[PDB]
Amino acid sequence: LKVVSSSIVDKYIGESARLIREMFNYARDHQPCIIFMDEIDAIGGRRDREIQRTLMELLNQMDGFDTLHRVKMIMATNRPDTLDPALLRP
Amino acid sequence: SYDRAITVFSPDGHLFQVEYAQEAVKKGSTAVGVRGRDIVVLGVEKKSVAKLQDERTVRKICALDDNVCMAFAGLTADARIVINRARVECQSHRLTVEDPVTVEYITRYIASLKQRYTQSNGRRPFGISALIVGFDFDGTPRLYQTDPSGTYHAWKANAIGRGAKSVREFLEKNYTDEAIETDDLTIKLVIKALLEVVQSGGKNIELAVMRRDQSLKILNPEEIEKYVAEIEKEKEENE
Amino acid sequence: YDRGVNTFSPEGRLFQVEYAIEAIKLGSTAIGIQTSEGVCLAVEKRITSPLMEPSSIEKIVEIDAHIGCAMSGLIADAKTLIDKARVETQNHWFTYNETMTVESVTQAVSNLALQFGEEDSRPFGVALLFGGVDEKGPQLFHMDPSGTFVQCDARAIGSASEGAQSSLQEVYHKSMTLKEAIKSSLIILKQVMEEKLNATNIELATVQPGQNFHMFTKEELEEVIKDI
Amino acid sequence: IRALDEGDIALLKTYGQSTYSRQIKQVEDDIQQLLKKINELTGIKESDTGLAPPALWDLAADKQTLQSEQPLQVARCTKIINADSEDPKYIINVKQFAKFVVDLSDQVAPTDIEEGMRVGVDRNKYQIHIPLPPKIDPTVTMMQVEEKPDVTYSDVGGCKEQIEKLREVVETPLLHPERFVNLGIEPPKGVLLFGPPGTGKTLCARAVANRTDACFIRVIGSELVQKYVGEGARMVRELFEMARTKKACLIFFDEIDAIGGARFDDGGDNEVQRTMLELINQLDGFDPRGNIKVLMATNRPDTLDPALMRPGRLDRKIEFSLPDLEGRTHIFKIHARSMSVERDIRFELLARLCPNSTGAEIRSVCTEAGMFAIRARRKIATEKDFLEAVNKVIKSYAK
Amino acid sequence: LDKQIKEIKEVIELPVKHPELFEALGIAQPKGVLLYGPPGTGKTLLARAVAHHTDCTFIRVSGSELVQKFIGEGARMVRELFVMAREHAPSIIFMDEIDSIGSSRLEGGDSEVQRTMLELLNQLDGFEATKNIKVIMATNRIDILDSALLRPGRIDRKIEFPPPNEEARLDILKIHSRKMNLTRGINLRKIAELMPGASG
Amino acid sequence: KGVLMYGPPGTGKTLLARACAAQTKATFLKLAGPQLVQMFIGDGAKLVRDAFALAKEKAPSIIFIDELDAIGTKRFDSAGDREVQRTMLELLNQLDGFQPNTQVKVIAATNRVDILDPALLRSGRLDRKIEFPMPNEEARARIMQIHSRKMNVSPDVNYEELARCTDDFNGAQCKAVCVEAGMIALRRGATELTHEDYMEGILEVQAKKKANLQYYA
Amino acid sequence: SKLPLVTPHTQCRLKLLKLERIKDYLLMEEEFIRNQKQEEERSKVDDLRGTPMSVGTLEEIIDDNHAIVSTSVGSEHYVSILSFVDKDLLEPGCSVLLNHKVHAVIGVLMDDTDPLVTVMKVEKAPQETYADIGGLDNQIQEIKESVELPLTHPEYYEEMGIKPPKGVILYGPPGTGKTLLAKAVANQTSATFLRVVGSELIQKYLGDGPKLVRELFRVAEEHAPSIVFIDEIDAIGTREIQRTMLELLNQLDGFDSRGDVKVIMATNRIETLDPALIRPGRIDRKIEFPLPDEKTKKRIFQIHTSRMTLADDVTLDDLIMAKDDLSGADIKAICTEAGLMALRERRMKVTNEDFKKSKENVLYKKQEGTP
Amino acid sequence: CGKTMLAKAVAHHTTAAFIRVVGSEGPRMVRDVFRLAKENAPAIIFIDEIDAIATKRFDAQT
Ligand SMILES: Nc1ncnc2c1ncn2[C@@H]1O[C@H](COP(=O)(O)OP(=O)(O)OP(=O)(O)O)[C@@H](O)[C@H]1O
Ligand SMILES: Nc1ncnc2c1ncn2[C@@H]1O[C@H](COP(=O)(O)OP(=O)(O)O)[C@@H](O)[C@H]1O
Ligand SMILES: Nc1ncnc2c1ncn2[C@@H]1O[C@H](COP(=O)(O)OP(=O)(O)O)[C@@H](O)[C@H]1O
Ligand SMILES: Nc1ncnc2c1ncn2[C@@H]1O[C@H](COP(=O)(O)OP(=O)(O)O)[C@@H](O)[C@H]1O
Ligand SMILES: [Mg+2]
């Protein structure tokens, strides 16, 4: 799973959070899988509304990782400083 | 580039800190001085003596020469500083110069001291203005005003302080181009304004007089109240 | 680039002294004319109230028997510059006994003016006209806070400098008699600057080579008043 | 002091009371209640909808047309399939409802419809029958001047050279294209007007609007600066396509300095810069601009972006300066032309009396003379009146 | 707070409960009161109780809530708060720690702080629809506040809340112990004496 | 597969893009930076992606993204502009990221390359950075010849001297000189414009004469 | 409509008589109302627009009787217009009635949106009057010549050829009567009054500043004879806020023709305002509101204490004297504070000592400087 | 050391909901945090490394 992070963004109300949830559900359904969301800062910048509400859903879906799934994830960015420190937490 | 300093100009080019000094003068009490046919008179208001505050100590009127007299309106600390400097300058000039002091020279001295103090970084200007009356204008009376910009001008009659807007207009209303006969008449005229400015209470008219030949003369509150009663009789005429 | 002269703009200009020029602009207007007959200067008092002594505002001064001055700006330190000019003339003449060239007097005033970032304050926010006569020529000269200075034939500074300068430029020519120059300058001042002439707000001072006495105009304006 | 007790209040709110306050209070209360009663009896004030004068309208035509025609929905056309140029099968994108593959009715023709085209579509078979005019933003569509301002060139004083240069670009090629075409020269297509405020820039703009025959559109800074991103650029796009719809047109951006600010990064406003870049691209970029002549006025020539001053977007720059003596006399003549004034007024005397006064100052002084006169109730303004006005305005500036 | 409570009954309650006197006197009703004292001295409690007895509505906004991060937002907040109060019948407006937006600002951004305090002063000065509308202000350590709101045409009165004394400590201890299960042999007066300079 | 063209306003970048669109015979997508930003939350990236998808669907395709200064600007700006950042990032990864994009050539033009990203100013996205300088004096003479091709100039026009007077002129300013000379010839009513008209046009176009830089400080 | 004005204020038989006359007339109205066709036009039009009828928004008019109309569901419809709808009352953005079944355009609904300026329309101007303001004689004449007389009697200016002044600035210390005079001139000529106080036009969004200015002047044009009172022009006037200044200035003297709307602005700090904002061509009347003098202060005291019950001993002159250090607002505060002092002592009838204590306390509410 | 660990454990064992904000993360944020607490009655709020906001008070400049 390769993602341009700005591709996650959509103008319909709450559609992006559904997109992230469905992406992780497809990840769980089709193991083994690797999720590579690139240019994470696009939806990972420090706390226009929908992007923050979607980063919340990304955080929730990330924390939902049980130890058993064969699912791993890469995020790439050129400006890691702009990234929200929420992601930086172990 | 906003003001924020003493030695910098806004794009208009005016030193706003000098303006702040002149407003610091504006927050002071009234002070109206005049020159008469022969004599110069002064009466200061807003004594507001609060019981244990014995009014003599603050010395609203200071005489610093063999004969010259004025305090300074504004903040009184710089007033007393310029008082000490005026004492030193007048005595030193009288000792060193072949002839004694004249009012023009000492007024230029005060203006130059204010300008020199202002013209530097890290040196607060004297936010004080004064009205100087002196005798040795070749044995004639004349009145000067000094402004924190270090400026000195000559007046027949001037007002500074809280009454500057009002009393000056009062003067513009009634300063007789006729040289004031019976200089006590000029004293009554100035006492009228000095009272009317502060609610005409009759308690803070604290007054000095010098006939351009005499030494310092002072007016006690009862003798000043005499001129006040004459002015009241003059005002009662409208009936 | 706001703290002082010791900072340069991207275009090099110092963002301190242009404000001193604008400080010239906030002062009362002043005019000067150079003629082969005599050199003349004029100045507006802006007498705040006639209860003041109009002569008290020293906006027109005599440095010496051959040289007079006028200024526009903050005025306060302009008097200091006149003091420097007077001490310059006194010292140089008492030492050398040769007359100070008005060019040299302006040069000395400029040398004083260059003491705000050139040693070890702030520019003197005022401009000056000097009018003088000397054994080699009658001259008029102009001085500004930057310390630069220029010879001019018909000069104007202060508030309303541009319009007065335009009219003065249009009336001038190289062979005018000082009477016609004075009358043209006065009528210009009347039309553009304030109002009809009167003794309590206008000032004129003129100097001629053979006259070391009365470089002023005083108590004789009446003839002009009826015949302007 | 003890607080006001209820007994103290009761004693206080009477005794000092008069011998009428009880009766008068009962009177005013009854006035109020019966005024509510009047409101209830007269009922709710009728609200209308607008049914024109009764004699003007109806006829059986209205109801017959209502029951006979079709209230079509509006759609975007899209992706003309044209699978054989015989069964075209156009897609439509009816907004907020749906999108359909549909065909034409028996009336319209394939050459009539294009991709986009904002077609009209029937409500139950979704067939296509009407070509509708494209979507123009209402704020953009009102931006057209419509009513010509009454001021003409002859009402502009002193600016002979400036008006000549302006009319060379904005008026002459439209009036007489043969001059340029038979000499084989392409006329300039952009003018900037710059000068101190109140020098007449907007006035000569109004004059252009008068003498102009082609479409004239007025633009000010607030018109283009929206809160939403890209929406200002969108407005610029709509404005320029509307101008392209006309056979030649004029666009006039008053106060371009509101949006023309030069780009800066390390600080900025950015969105205003984005709208200004869209304006730049429309003015001179890919695709010909068209016969769209452009006129802009600004109080700050230096502040605008250097790309905007560039020739090809602002070909001719015209400076309006504080008028000279002759210009001041001319503007005095022009403004006193309408006013009731005594015959021999020596306007040149006042004009020379004027300091560096803008044209707005001349209009203000004329109005001030008029006001002094009307205060005096005299039907004619006089020279003493004009002198008084000159004083009033000049000392008012002097403050 | 019996002395303070009596003063605030007078100034607030009398115009709202008995406006007729101010009609008979003809004088316009007083607009609001500032409350100043060390933090914790029952200022909000007093305002809340006064609103409860006067039967009019209580609306609160702390000064810190006014600031916001954008220009033109404090003005909007104040204006719409006044709209809410006017729409809410007789009402008292309470603003805690008003000093947070009223203080020394001549030092010099800061622009929105002035554009907020000036807007609030404009709302109260124009006596906008002040039919039974009152405002209440609270400050800790009055000195940091500025006179722009206390100027005579503006908010009318000040009330001081010094730290509770021995008798006041007696009351407050009694009131907050009224619900707690206490035991015989208690000596609460020794406790109040042992706590000098409490803030309530 | 990426060409950024740049230079101060008035060199000819847009002209070069137009000429390239002329003599290429391929699908040409012309756009400006403000076209991509738009209002809605996700629609700008959708526009960028759809433009590139169309370019693929018409494989011989050149995309001329003019005024790249609009979408392209330093990531952390001044911030509610992050929508522009996201659209620009979609562009960034629609130029070189994961799936390669071949046969779709991109041309970009800007006047403020200092403003642009260090990202979309990379080497994999915009391989060629083409500087458009101030026209040199033979370039200025050539530009004046080009623009005066059909204006019926005088048989003796000393283009070299015009180039000598027109220092610091951009090419657009040279075209302005040509059209101004034509208009001035119209004012004289002359059926053919000549050298004096060109000098007068040079006076018209050049500058504001600066000011009194001895009064300066 | 409202009740007439009753202008004896002391409780006297004259007041009761006037109220009784009002009572009698209103009772006759009661009697009249209580003491109690076009069916062809109804059955035609009000039945073609068969109930219910929906409400939508007109977007464009394309033909003589065909328009594009949107509805709350956001859909778009090309639909005919029946003949009785007033064409000139139809424009883009207009709320329009529609037949429920075939969306037919059946009448314009008078606008009920744009709520900000809708409440901004004051219509409650009658609280003040020229009578209520005392002592501003020269300022009254200035404002009359400037904003009022052109509205009440444009005849003089059209006959003379003057385009009347159409923008005014008021300046002076606060509480001197600037807002009072604005509302009074709003009352004397019944042209509608719009107020918007300074910083409240300043907004966080990029648009709402200039947009608010634009819609304010738009509504002012729509009401036609109108007054726009910009109080505290300081906050905006002393890039974005400068852009709001630019829009206000253009709306004052710009393109198009502004029409009949008058503009009065008020400031405390005139010397600080941007010279562009004070356009001497546009802002041709600057009016100073200085601190009241003796005659004025007497007038303000008289008007404000007039509605008060007074004792015999009040020495009104000695109340005035002083050195004119109090504006009118301070005098009103004096009146209220003296009334409170009288009420504390239980006097429903104020005395001189009440005013003395009031003035002393109010003056104590000034200054903080020690030296 | 387990400051957050034990808080999390308590939140898991009890019926509470555990809301967390770190001090490095103005007053409107605190208002929203307490309001979001109010939405769930047994919910717990946690401030992590608060000291930055709760540092000793004095005359603030900027
Ligand atoms: N070398 C040249 N040859 C011919 N014409 C030129 C040349 N240089 C410039 N021009 C002319 O000057 C103009 C150049 O503007 P162009 O449309 O190319 O935009 P640009 O200089 O890239 O500006 P911007 O960056 O603002 O878009 C054109 O009208 C063109 O005819
Ligand atoms: N040359 C002129 N001839 C006649 N009237 C002029 C002239 N210049 C200025 N005015 C008058 O002064 C006003 C100047 O406004 P203007 O300068 O167009 O506004 P802006 O500065 O916003 O462009 C106009 O109303 C006009 O009536
Ligand atoms: N006299 C009192 N009687 C009862 N409770 C009090 C008293 N004074 C203070 N309190 C308690 O302390 C709190 C004081 O809050 P308050 O003084 O409004 O704080 P601040 O000073 O920050 O506005 C009240 O909520 C109340 O519960
Ligand atoms: N000349 C006057 N006559 C009557 N009342 C006045 C006068 N001047 C001031 N006031 C009082 O001051 C208040 C109006 O103050 P004003 O100056 O309009 O406020 P602002 O300074 O905000 O414009 C009114 O309540 C009025 O009673
Ligand atoms: Mg281009």
Side-chain angles (χ1 to χ4, degrees), chain F residues 173-191:
Chain F
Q173 283 183 357
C174 302
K175 186 180 201 304
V177 172
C178 302
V179 47
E180 221 69 29
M183 302 294 285
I184 285 162
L186 181 163
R187 182 158 30 263
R188 299 198 298 105
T191 47

CSV table of all heavy atoms in Angstrom, one decimal, chain F residues 173-191:
chain,number,residue,atom,x,y,z
F,173,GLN,N,9.9,45.2,-22.6
F,173,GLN,CA,10.1,46.7,-22.7
F,173,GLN,C,10.6,47.1,-24.1
F,173,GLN,O,10.3,48.2,-24.6
F,173,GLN,CB,11.1,47.2,-21.6
F,173,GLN,CG,10.5,47.3,-20.2
F,173,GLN,CD,11.5,47.8,-19.2
F,173,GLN,OE1,12.6,48.0,-19.5
F,173,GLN,NE2,11.0,48.0,-18.0
F,174,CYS,N,11.4,46.2,-24.8
F,174,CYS,CA,11.8,46.5,-26.1
F,174,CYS,C,10.5,46.4,-27.1
F,174,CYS,O,10.4,47.3,-28.0
F,174,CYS,CB,12.8,45.5,-26.6
F,174,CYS,SG,14.3,45.5,-25.6
F,175,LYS,N,9.6,45.5,-26.9
F,175,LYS,CA,8.4,45.5,-27.6
F,175,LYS,C,7.6,46.7,-27.3
F,175,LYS,O,7.0,47.3,-28.2
F,175,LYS,CB,7.6,44.2,-27.3
F,175,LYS,CG,6.3,44.1,-28.1
F,175,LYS,CD,5.6,42.8,-27.8
F,175,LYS,CE,4.7,42.4,-28.9
F,175,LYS,NZ,3.7,43.5,-29.3
F,176,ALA,N,7.6,47.2,-26.1
F,176,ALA,CA,7.0,48.4,-25.7
F,176,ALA,C,7.6,49.6,-26.5
F,176,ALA,O,6.9,50.5,-26.9
F,176,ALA,CB,7.1,48.6,-24.2
F,177,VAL,N,8.9,49.6,-26.6
F,177,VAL,CA,9.6,50.7,-27.4
F,177,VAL,C,9.1,50.6,-28.8
F,177,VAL,O,8.8,51.7,-29.4
F,177,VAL,CB,11.1,50.5,-27.3
F,177,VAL,CG1,11.8,51.5,-28.3
F,177,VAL,CG2,11.6,50.7,-25.9
F,178,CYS,N,8.9,49.4,-29.4
F,178,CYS,CA,8.5,49.3,-30.8
F,178,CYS,C,7.0,49.9,-30.9
F,178,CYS,O,6.8,50.7,-31.8
F,178,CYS,CB,8.5,47.9,-31.3
F,178,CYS,SG,10.2,47.1,-31.2
F,179,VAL,N,6.1,49.5,-30.1
F,179,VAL,CA,4.7,49.9,-30.2
F,179,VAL,C,4.6,51.4,-29.9
F,179,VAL,O,3.8,52.1,-30.5
F,179,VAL,CB,3.8,49.1,-29.3
F,179,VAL,CG1,4.4,48.9,-27.9
F,179,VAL,CG2,2.4,49.7,-29.2
F,180,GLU,N,5.4,51.9,-28.9
F,180,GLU,CA,5.4,53.3,-28.6
F,180,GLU,C,5.9,54.1,-29.8
F,180,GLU,O,5.4,55.2,-30.1
F,180,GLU,CB,6.2,53.6,-27.4
F,180,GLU,CG,5.6,54.6,-26.5
F,180,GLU,CD,4.4,54.1,-25.8
F,180,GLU,OE1,4.3,52.8,-25.6
F,180,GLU,OE2,3.5,54.9,-25.4
F,181,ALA,N,6.9,53.6,-30.5
F,181,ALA,CA,7.4,54.3,-31.7
F,181,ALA,C,6.3,54.3,-32.8
F,181,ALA,O,6.1,55.3,-33.4
F,181,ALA,CB,8.7,53.6,-32.2
F,182,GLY,N,5.6,53.2,-32.9
F,182,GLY,CA,4.5,53.2,-33.9
F,182,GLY,C,3.4,54.3,-33.5
F,182,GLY,O,2.9,55.0,-34.3
F,183,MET,N,3.0,54.3,-32.2
F,183,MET,CA,2.0,55.3,-31.8
F,183,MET,C,2.5,56.7,-32.0
F,183,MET,O,1.7,57.6,-32.3
F,183,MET,CB,1.7,55.0,-30.3
F,183,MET,CG,1.2,53.7,-30.0
F,183,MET,SD,-0.4,53.3,-30.7
F,183,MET,CE,-1.5,54.3,-29.7
F,184,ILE,N,3.8,57.0,-31.7
F,184,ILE,CA,4.3,58.3,-31.9
F,184,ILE,C,4.3,58.7,-33.3
F,184,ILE,O,4.0,59.8,-33.7
F,184,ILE,CB,5.7,58.4,-31.2
F,184,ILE,CG1,5.6,58.4,-29.7
F,184,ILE,CG2,6.5,59.6,-31.8
F,184,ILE,CD1,6.9,58.1,-29.0
F,185,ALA,N,4.7,57.7,-34.2
F,185,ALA,CA,4.6,58.0,-35.6
F,185,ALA,C,3.1,58.3,-36.0
F,185,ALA,O,2.9,59.2,-36.9
F,185,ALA,CB,5.1,56.8,-36.4
F,186,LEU,N,2.2,57.7,-35.4
F,186,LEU,CA,0.8,58.0,-35.6
F,186,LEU,C,0.5,59.4,-35.2
F,186,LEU,O,-0.3,60.2,-35.8
F,186,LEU,CB,-0.2,57.0,-34.9
F,186,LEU,CG,-1.7,57.1,-35.0
F,186,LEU,CD1,-2.3,55.8,-34.6
F,186,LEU,CD2,-2.3,58.2,-34.1
F,187,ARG,N,1.1,59.9,-34.0
F,187,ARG,CA,0.9,61.2,-33.6
F,187,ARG,C,1.4,62.2,-34.6
F,187,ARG,O,0.8,63.3,-34.9
F,187,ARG,CB,1.5,61.4,-32.2
F,187,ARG,CG,1.3,62.8,-31.7
F,187,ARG,CD,1.4,62.9,-30.1
F,187,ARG,NE,2.4,62.0,-29.6
F,187,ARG,CZ,2.0,60.8,-29.0
F,187,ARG,NH1,0.7,60.4,-29.0
F,187,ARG,NH2,2.9,60.0,-28.5
F,188,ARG,N,2.6,62.0,-35.2
F,188,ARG,CA,3.1,62.8,-36.3
F,188,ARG,C,2.4,62.5,-37.6
F,188,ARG,O,2.5,63.3,-38.5
F,188,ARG,CB,4.6,62.5,-36.5
F,188,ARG,CG,5.5,62.8,-35.3
F,188,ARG,CD,6.9,62.9,-35.7
F,188,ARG,NE,7.5,61.7,-36.2
F,188,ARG,CZ,7.7,61.5,-37.5
F,188,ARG,NH1,7.4,62.4,-38.4
F,188,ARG,NH2,8.2,60.3,-37.9
F,189,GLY,N,1.6,61.4,-37.6
F,189,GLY,CA,0.9,61.1,-38.9
F,189,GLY,C,1.8,60.5,-39.9
F,189,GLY,O,1.3,60.4,-41.1
F,190,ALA,N,3.0,60.2,-39.6
F,190,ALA,CA,4.0,59.7,-40.5
F,190,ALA,C,3.6,58.3,-40.9
F,190,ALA,O,3.3,57.5,-40.1
F,190,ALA,CB,5.4,59.7,-39.9
F,191,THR,N,3.6,58.1,-42.3
F,191,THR,CA,3.3,56.8,-42.8
F,191,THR,C,4.4,55.7,-42.5
F,191,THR,O,4.1,54.5,-42.7
F,191,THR,CB,3.0,56.9,-44.3
F,191,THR,OG1,4.1,57.6,-44.9
F,191,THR,CG2,1.7,57.5,-44.6
